[PDB]
Amino acid sequence: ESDSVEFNNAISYVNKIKTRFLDHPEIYRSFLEILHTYQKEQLHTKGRPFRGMSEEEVFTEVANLFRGQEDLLSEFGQFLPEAKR
Amino acid sequence: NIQMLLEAADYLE
């Protein structure tokens, strides 16, 4: 995976998101904080139970951001496991 | 999959 299509595939997602909300920079920060939050609720040595986090939450937070604008949501969903149908 | 997106942000930034 030196530079698989998936790599540029991901970059395109983040890029488009940036160029999309050029007027609303605050949006960019949030999205990144979402994926970032995931990482936070992972470390801390042993994964002791305490309402952690995973892909499910990230999907919600990002969805909350891109409300109505499910266009970008579709891209994010591609990475996440497809639900029913 | 998240690794690519999360990492992607750093690339552009």
Side-chain angles (χ1 to χ4, degrees):
Chain A
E1 299 180 60
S2 179
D3 54 61
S4 166
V5 173
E6 303 180 300
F7 181 42
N8 299 300
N9 191 314
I11 307 300
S12 301
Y13 183 45
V14 186
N15 188 310
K16 185 183 289 76
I17 294 176
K18 185 185 297 179
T19 188
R20 174 54 180 64
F21 304 81
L22 286 176
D23 182 297
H24 299 299
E26 60 180 0
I27 315 287
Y28 190 65
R29 289 280 72 67
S30 180
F31 173 63
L32 302 185
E33 181 180 60
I34 298 176
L35 293 172
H36 248 304
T37 300
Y38 172 69
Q39 292 292 173
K40 299 178 61 60
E41 299 300 301
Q42 178 183 181
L43 299 174
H44 300 183
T45 61
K46 285 63 62 60
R48 301 182 301 180
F50 190 46
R51 299 295 179 181
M53 177 177 178
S54 59
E55 301 180 60
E56 57 181 300
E57 181 71 60
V58 183
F59 179 46
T60 302
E61 298 184 1
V62 178
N64 286 304
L65 258 173
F66 299 177
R67 177 62 180 297
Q69 299 168 178
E70 300 181 59
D71 301 300
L72 300 166
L73 229 313
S74 184
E75 301 180 60
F76 185 44
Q78 297 177 182
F79 293 62
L80 309 182
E82 300 297 63
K84 177 179 178 59
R85 193 287 300 180
Chain B
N1 57 64
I2 299 301
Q3 176 282 300
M4 292 66 181
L5 300 184
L6 178 63
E7 180 61 60
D10 185 3
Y11 175 60
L12 297 176
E13 180 179 0

